[PDB]
Structure 1
Amino acid sequence: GIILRVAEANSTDPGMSRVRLDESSRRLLDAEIGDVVEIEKVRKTVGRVYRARPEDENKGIVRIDSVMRNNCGASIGDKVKVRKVRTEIAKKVTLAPIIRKDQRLKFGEGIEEYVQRALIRRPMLEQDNISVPGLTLAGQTGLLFKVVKTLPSKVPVEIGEETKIEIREEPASEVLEEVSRISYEDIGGLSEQLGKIREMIELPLKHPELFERLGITPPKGVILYGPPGTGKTLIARAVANESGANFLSINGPEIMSKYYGQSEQKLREIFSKAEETAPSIIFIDEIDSIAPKREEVQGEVERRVVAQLLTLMDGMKERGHVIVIGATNRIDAIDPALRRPGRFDREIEIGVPDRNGRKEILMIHTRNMPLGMSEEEKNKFLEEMADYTYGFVGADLAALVRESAMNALRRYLPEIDLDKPIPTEILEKMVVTEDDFKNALKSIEPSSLREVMVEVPNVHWDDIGGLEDVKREIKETVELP
């Protein structure tokens, strides 16, 4: 009714509070375009956004930015109350750093330059955390600032271009929901698969009694595939962020450091926390190390660690309200008995991206820096980078652009400013020309070891010549059924 949905923003609008609202969705609320919005939901957490119309989306959902959902702690399908309010402008705003794992923060100037041009008329309120990326991939990422006081406090305000900004720099922590959480929009990859993997554990993990025995038996286990730690492993820790439950980490360095009698007791030790932290999710990326077994002799510790993990899941009635999942590099390095009942049943194969899927993966790593989608229509758009790149992955793309960031460095940083204090002039000098990403394509970094791949062509019938007799005949065969 007023209840308009939250979702993962396709068009990101890297400037926060710019959240897309449909023209057909806003006329359902009878709120016109270009007004200050008040987002009010349960827990009495609030935030303000600016309406801008997308196209492909329909009135069934409203597609919202990640951080503004990370400010209200919104999960997909929540309940909010939004309406248009009065419009004002700020005067002088004071901000403060958010220090938890950050180890202090930026020292020097840029209190005006970096903040002002990135404001772009963001509706907001006092004590709100704004996310302002840009200026580079390495050293500058999505960064949250704690706003102390503005002169028009608690009232709806859009900070203008002629309004000064003061940075107190006094070290403090976040008032509202800082990072270490990764939203589904902060995630990127296969789209429909992201919703299909989550929907099975969606309803149980939220509430136990919402979906328990009703529809079917809940998930026993889930086996994941693909580049384990390209950001496929980041999805594991990411899924536990929206659910809010505990995340148990079964990792390489612990199973390698624990030999006979140390690991055997640790298997029940991590399982003892599974019953205590319950409800909790159990993610194992060590299936390659734990149970590589093809039925040979890897030693007693290898057969002991797998036999216990089988009994650890068997020792559970399947109700502590917990879900054990697993991940591995490829379709191989897995124990064949894991597909037997009484243990892991569902296996979800995670594939690779496509020309459109790569753009979703790139969009995650697209903005730490000063790039744009609508603001550069073609030259810096991701599809021009997608068509040349073949057989890559998020971490490879992340390390590729980071190596391509050094191309932006070697043309700027070393021969100009070697000083530890960061000048204010070097900030305007930071941009990214497509040549930096093209120079990495010519250099040897690209490698594709992937056996199975797919593609889609660019070829239309405008470049096709004669033989129209087969043309309509090809339509006869293929297109009719």
Structure 2
Amino acid sequence: MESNNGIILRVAEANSTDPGMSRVRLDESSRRLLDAEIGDVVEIEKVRKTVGRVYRARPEDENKGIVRIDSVMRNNCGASIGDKVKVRKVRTEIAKKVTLAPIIRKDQRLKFGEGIEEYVQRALIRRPMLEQDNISVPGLTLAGQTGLLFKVVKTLPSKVPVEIGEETKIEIREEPASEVLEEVSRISYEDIGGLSEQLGKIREMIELPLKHPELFERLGITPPKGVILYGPPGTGKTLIARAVANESGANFLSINGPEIMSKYYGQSEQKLREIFSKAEETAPSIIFIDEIDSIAPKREEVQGEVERRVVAQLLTLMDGMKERGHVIVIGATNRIDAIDPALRRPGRFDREIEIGVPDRNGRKEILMIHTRNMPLGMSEEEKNKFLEEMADYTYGFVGADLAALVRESAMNALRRYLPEIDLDKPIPTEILEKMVVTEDDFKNALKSIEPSSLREVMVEVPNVHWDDIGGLEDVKREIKETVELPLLKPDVFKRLGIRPSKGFLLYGPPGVGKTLLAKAVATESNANFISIKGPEVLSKWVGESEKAIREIFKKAKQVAPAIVFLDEIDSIAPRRGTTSDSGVTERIVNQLLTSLDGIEVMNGVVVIGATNRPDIMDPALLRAGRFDKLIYIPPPDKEARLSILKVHTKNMPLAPDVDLNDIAQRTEGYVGADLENLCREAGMNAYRENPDATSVSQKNFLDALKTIRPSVDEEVIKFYRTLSET
């Protein structure tokens, strides 16, 4: 079906969804293989034998083999990933008069628009479209909708696809009509996208058993039986099951726990049996239970037979299906803590994986869907998006939080604009145009926010290198050889016949940037970084979870290769400082000791211990066989202060009057974290350009030493000299 390039192309998913949906991306070779020219309109013909066209655009990070195409236009004429296309340079006539009408069913005959002059005219320019089709029309500030859907009844060019020019007279019939294809409620994997790699991975999980019949959606393969999704309750996760149906091309069944639990003995299990008994005739279909955890919450706790039956009736109906009708079971829950051992075995459930939360990227698509749900749903032209900078700023939140926050962004404009008009009925094209949620209004609306979120730490890749915190190349040299040899050179262990250290321990003065050292080796090795600190050991201790602390390794082992970093362990002991309300050890560390023995370093895992001081740490926690090497971090010396601060101040204001040698020679008994400070302290006095009107010179960096200088930190040092003897 999909061929590299030519009259046939590889249909692939565009990650930006293209600026417009006719803007499809292309590679410079993909055109030469079709004998075409990039930057032009092209006529396409696709399987199912339907007509269509788009506009090819620049490649960005594109592999020559493929062609990244939108799902909407692909789905508008109809298609899926893995189909075949037929395309050529041919440019047919240009639309002259076109007739359009909206879908009246979700409207239920309500609120006709003025878009004849308002939208289509200024949104018109050279948009490749199709005759006898349903075109996505932008506009109409965010409803949570997808653009605006107008049907294409006819365009004056007959039986050929076309793009409309500005020369045209457009007609909005303002009368009945309905989609030529797809539906009014539709969603694609990209419209729902909270993730890129994982979403495509979770796709392959479901997509390999569900593909299409002419390939394996029905064929032996011994596929899995049922699936369960985890992590971010609500948001995009709950919508996944709804997205898998539209793209897979199969019927969709919503099954919720409370609606089953809401119903009672008798009808309850009947309604469940009816749905699964209704799936055979409607097959192919997707069985999805949402709150299943509430249908099978049992661990040892069972308060009734009605629950035993419905889950046991669920057991009967799973095994009762041989996948002859090929109705697949999928599931979701926020926690696996509710699952019964019975539901972990084949014939019932097979492939189940954790789904995480978005990253800078994941929010970007979600933010991209917002500007799409906003006006400019189907974009007329290609425009540089300053929404780019938003995703980098944002953090902490999931999909639902943004959408609700973007609704909190719409109210900010809404509050000011429309109530001034006080709409009884039709709305000014002027007002509705002049109000813009586009790249301008965002930041003004982002000045107000009402999010709330709760999560736990995960993998990260720092930016650290040897320059950020210099000095102590000796430890860094062996830190190189700690990860590198087990990582790159496991075969060197054959010739040696040795078992490398399971881990090493770091201790020394606080404030030296022990975290930077952990991040440094992590950035070098490129392995993922997980730091277990004291505050979070205190945070999850609020809900009384010691298990969660153990899970961090279980979550670290699955995401490996990664570097698991341990600092401020047994956090209950350090947090109280000199005093204590309890003993030197508790039930908490017991869950930590059992963990270290369990976690294996034969994977890309790397065990790194760190502590402010080991003496306060319970000596039994420091026993060898777990941390074999005892490493000591002394405070950076005079030469390090020069290089360290030389790295700090070189990226911020400086002056030639400044001499960096004088400042480092006067300081001793001093740490690295203060070098961050000492660099900026002068700044508050003067910067190169700041409203203070002052400037950088030896004066402010001299005032920095006057503002910050040794705090009498020599104490921690002379403990370490004696601490290494005992």
Q: Same fold (TM over 0.5)?
A: yes
Deviates more, 1:326-335 or 1:72-81: 326-335
C-alpha offsets along residues 308-330 of structure 1, whole Å, 9 cap, x if unaligned?
Answer: 11121122234432321111123
Are the aligned partners of 1:25 and 1:58 in contact in 2 as well (CA < 8 Å)?
no
Cα distance, 1:433 vs structure 2: 6.6
Are the aligned partners of 1:231 and 1:395 in contact in 2 as well (CA < 8 Å)?
yes
C-alpha root-mean-square deviation of aligned residues, in Å? Answer: 3.3
Higher relative contact order (CA 8 A, sep 6+): 1
Cα distance, 1:57 vs structure 2: 1.0
Cα distance, 1:384 vs structure 2: 2.6
Deviates more, 1:459-468 or 1:55-64: 459-468
Are the aligned partners of 1:136 and 1:369 in contact in 2 as well (CA < 8 Å)?
yes
C-alpha offsets along residues 100-136 of structure 1, whole Å, 9 cap, x if unaligned?
Answer: 3332355242312311222231122322221123352
CA–CA distance in 1 between the matches of 2:335 and 2:204? Answer: 23
State the partner residue of 1:406. 411
CA–CA distance in 1 between the matches of 2:338 and 2:154? Answer: 56
CA–CA distance in 1 between the matches of 2:150 and 2:423? Answer: 27
CA–CA distance in 1 between the matches of 2:290 and 2:59? Answer: 39
C-alpha offsets along residues 21-60 of structure 1, whole Å, 9 cap, x if unaligned?
Answer: 2222111111112333222122211111111122211232
CA–CA distance in 1 between the matches of 2:86 and 2:193? Answer: 28
- Other structure's SS at 1:200 match: helix
CA–CA distance in 1 between the matches of 2:379 and 2:438? Answer: 16
Cα distance, 1:463 vs structure 2: 6.5
Please point out which of 284, 287, 292 is paired with 1:287: 292
Deviates more, 1:154-163 or 1:419-428: 154-163
C-alpha offsets along residues 183-215 of structure 1, whole Å, 9 cap, x if unaligned?
Answer: 222230222222333334435444557448977
C-alpha offsets along residues 324-381 of structure 1, whole Å, 9 cap, x if unaligned?
Answer: 1111123333223311344212112111111122212322233122479999999963
CA–CA distance in 2 between the matches of 1:159 and 1:378? Answer: 19
- Other structure's SS at 1:144 match: strand
C-alpha change, 1:274 and 1:156, in structure 2 (3 Å) is closer
- Other structure's SS at 1:2 match: coil
C-alpha change, 1:356 and 1:139, in structure 2 (3 Å) is closer
State the partner residue of 1:443. 448
CA–CA distance in 1 between the matches of 2:124 and 2:139? Answer: 13
C-alpha change, 1:247 and 1:110, in structure 2 (3 Å) is closer
Are the aligned partners of 1:9 and 1:65 in contact in 2 as well (CA < 8 Å)?
yes
C-alpha change, 1:90 and 1:310, in structure 2 (3 Å) is same
Cα distance, 1:255 vs structure 2: 1.0
Deviates more, 1:459-468 or 1:416-425: 459-468
C-alpha change, 1:11 and 1:54, in structure 2 (3 Å) is farther
CA–CA distance in 2 between the matches of 1:413 and 1:462? Answer: 54
Cα distance, 1:471 vs structure 2: 7.7
C-alpha change, 1:318 and 1:479, in structure 2 (3 Å) is same
Deviates more, 1:322-331 or 1:366-375: 366-375
Q: TM-score, normalised by structure 2?
A: 0.60
CA–CA distance in 2 between the matches of 1:437 and 1:111? Answer: 28
C-alpha change, 1:143 and 1:271, in structure 2 (3 Å) is same
The gaps in structure 1 that reach 5 residues or longer are none
C-alpha change, 1:334 and 1:52, in structure 2 (3 Å) is same
C-alpha change, 1:136 and 1:455, in structure 2 (3 Å) is farther
Deviates more, 1:350-359 or 1:373-382: 373-382
Cα distance, 1:220 vs structure 2: 1.3
Q: TM-score, normalised by structure 1?
A: 0.88
State the partner residue of 2:14. 9
Cα distance, 1:282 vs structure 2: 0.9
C-alpha change, 1:429 and 1:324, in structure 2 (3 Å) is same
- Other structure's SS at 2:210 match: helix
Please point out which of 61, 82, 89 is paired with 2:87: 82
Cα distance, 1:62 vs structure 2: 0.9
C-alpha change, 1:125 and 1:341, in structure 2 (3 Å) is closer
Cα distance, 1:154 vs structure 2: 2.8
State the partner residue of 2:392. 387
CA–CA distance in 2 between the matches of 1:47 and 1:170? Answer: 26
- Is the aligned partner of 1:331 residue 2:342? no
Are the aligned partners of 1:225 and 1:327 in contact in 2 as well (CA < 8 Å)?
yes
Cα distance, 1:439 vs structure 2: 6.5
State the partner residue of 1:235. 240
C-alpha offsets along residues 56-109 of structure 1, whole Å, 9 cap, x if unaligned?
Answer: 112322111122111122110101111111354332222122223332355242
Are the aligned partners of 2:360 and 2:394 in contact in 1 as well (CA < 8 Å)?
no
Cα distance, 1:475 vs structure 2: 6.4
Please point out which of 150, 158, 162 is paired with 1:157: 162
- Other structure's SS at 1:204 match: coil
Are the aligned partners of 1:373 and 1:380 in contact in 2 as well (CA < 8 Å)?
no
C-alpha change, 1:79 and 1:321, in structure 2 (3 Å) is same
State the partner residue of 2:205. 200
CA–CA distance in 2 between the matches of 1:282 and 1:36? Answer: 42
CA–CA distance in 1 between the matches of 2:466 and 2:115? Answer: 53
C-alpha change, 1:168 and 1:376, in structure 2 (3 Å) is closer
CA–CA distance in 1 between the matches of 2:30 and 2:217? Answer: 34
CA–CA distance in 1 between the matches of 2:382 and 2:153? Answer: 37
Corresponding residue pairs, total: 481
CA–CA distance in 1 between the matches of 2:145 and 2:187? Answer: 17
C-alpha offsets along residues 162-191 of structure 1, whole Å, 9 cap, x if unaligned?
Answer: 423221111111123234232222230222
CA–CA distance in 2 between the matches of 1:207 and 1:114? Answer: 38
Deviates more, 1:115-124 or 1:462-471: 462-471
CA–CA distance in 2 between the matches of 1:42 and 1:142? Answer: 26
CA–CA distance in 1 between the matches of 2:475 and 2:381? Answer: 41
C-alpha change, 1:440 and 1:114, in structure 2 (3 Å) is closer
Are the aligned partners of 1:35 and 1:50 in contact in 2 as well (CA < 8 Å)?
yes
Are the aligned partners of 1:138 and 1:405 in contact in 2 as well (CA < 8 Å)?
no
C-alpha change, 1:379 and 1:128, in structure 2 (3 Å) is closer
CA–CA distance in 2 between the matches of 1:113 and 1:461? Answer: 58
C-alpha offsets along residues 209-231 of structure 1, whole Å, 9 cap, x if unaligned?
Answer: 74489774211111111234312
CA–CA distance in 1 between the matches of 2:11 and 2:214? Answer: 23
CA–CA distance in 2 between the matches of 1:138 and 1:351? Answer: 27
Are the aligned partners of 2:21 and 2:379 in contact in 1 as well (CA < 8 Å)?
no
Deviates more, 1:434-443 or 1:186-195: 434-443
- Other structure's SS at 1:206 match: coil
- Other structure's SS at 1:49 match: strand
Please point out which of 267, 270, 285 is paired with 2:275: 270
Are the aligned partners of 1:400 and 1:440 in contact in 2 as well (CA < 8 Å)?
no
Are the aligned partners of 1:38 and 1:83 in contact in 2 as well (CA < 8 Å)?
yes
C-alpha change, 1:329 and 1:59, in structure 2 (3 Å) is same
Cα distance, 1:18 vs structure 2: 1.8
C-alpha offsets along residues 396-432 of structure 1, whole Å, 9 cap, x if unaligned?
Answer: 2111101111012123222344443201111221213
The gaps in structure 2 that reach 5 residues or longer are 1-5, 487-726
